[PDB]
Amino acid sequence: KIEQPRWASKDSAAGAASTPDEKIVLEFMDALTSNDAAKLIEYFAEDTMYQNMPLPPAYGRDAVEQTLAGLFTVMSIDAVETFHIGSSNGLVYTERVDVLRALPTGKSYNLSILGVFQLTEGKITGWRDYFDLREFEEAVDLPLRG
Amino acid sequence: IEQPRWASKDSAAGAASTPDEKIVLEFMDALTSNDAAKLIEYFAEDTMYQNMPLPPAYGRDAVEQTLAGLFTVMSIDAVETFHIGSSNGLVYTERVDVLRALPTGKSYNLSILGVFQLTEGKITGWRDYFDLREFEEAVDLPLRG
Ligand SMILES: CCCCCCC(N)=O
Ligand SMILES: CCCCCCC(N)=O
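Above: inputs. Below: predicted complex with heptanamide.
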C-alpha cells in the first residue's frame, strides 16, 4: 500500500522519534486515521495555526477544528507512514505519505508530504503540510479548491 | 519576499547550527546562480533530486541535466530560508523561492519545504515539496509539459 522509497534514510534514528516533541508528533500522525476532528483538536493549543500549503491557512484553534471537520467530510485518511522525522529550534519536520480516500468517489491516492510542526509545552502551535494538490485531485476526481 | 505571520523572528531561526546546515545554506545562496555546473559540485555521484510534483532524477548526471533544463525555462531570482533544522543526516528548509518564467516574464513567490540528505558533506538527496499548479497559473506556463 505505501511503498518504501529508494531515498529512505538507512539511519534508524531518522525514522524514529528521538525527542519528546517528536514523540507527540508521531502520536498525532497515528491519530489522523481516526478522521475525528474533535479527537485531533485536543493536540492543539488555543493560539495555533494549520495550513495545507496549497490552500489558505486557518488561525486559532476553532478555525483549525472547523477546517479538519470539513476535511473529514470529504476524505478519509486511511494510512500514514512517516519515513523521516527530525527537529531543531522548536520545529519538528516529518517526511511522509498519507493515503487519502475521497468519500464521494471511493478513489484513493498516496500523497507525498513534507510537514512542519511547532510545539509549545507539548501542544501544537503551528502545523504546515507541503504537497502538490492537483495530482491528488486528478487521481480521486474531486476538485479540492472548491 | 515578505515574512509570514508564522515565521520565527528569533535571531537564530534560519541560521545554520551544524556543518550540514551550513552546507545547505551555502547551496541555497548558490541557487540564484541559475548555473547547473556550479550547483552539481554539491552533489555525490549516488544522489537524487526531486521537485515532488514531478518525477525524480537519480544519479549525478540526471540531476545535472534536470537542473540545466530547469534553468532554461526559469530563473531563481531570490531565496529566503525562514527555518532550518536537522537530525540524523537530514536537513530541512522552510523557504520561499522567487521564480521567474523566462518565456513569459512573469514571477511567483513559491512556498517550499525541502529536505536534504548529506553524506560526507555532499548531497545524496534533495526533495522540494510545494504546489505546482498555483505556480503554473501565476506564470502562464504548463510545467508538466
Ligand atoms: C485539503 C486536502 C489536504 C488533506 C491532506 C490531509 C493529510 N494531512 O493527509
Ligand atoms: C518545476 C519547477 C520547480 C523549480 C523550483 C526550483 C526552486 N527550488 O526554487
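Residues B 51, 54, 70, 76, 97, 99, 110, 128, 143 surround heptanamide (ligand 2) (CB under 6 Å).
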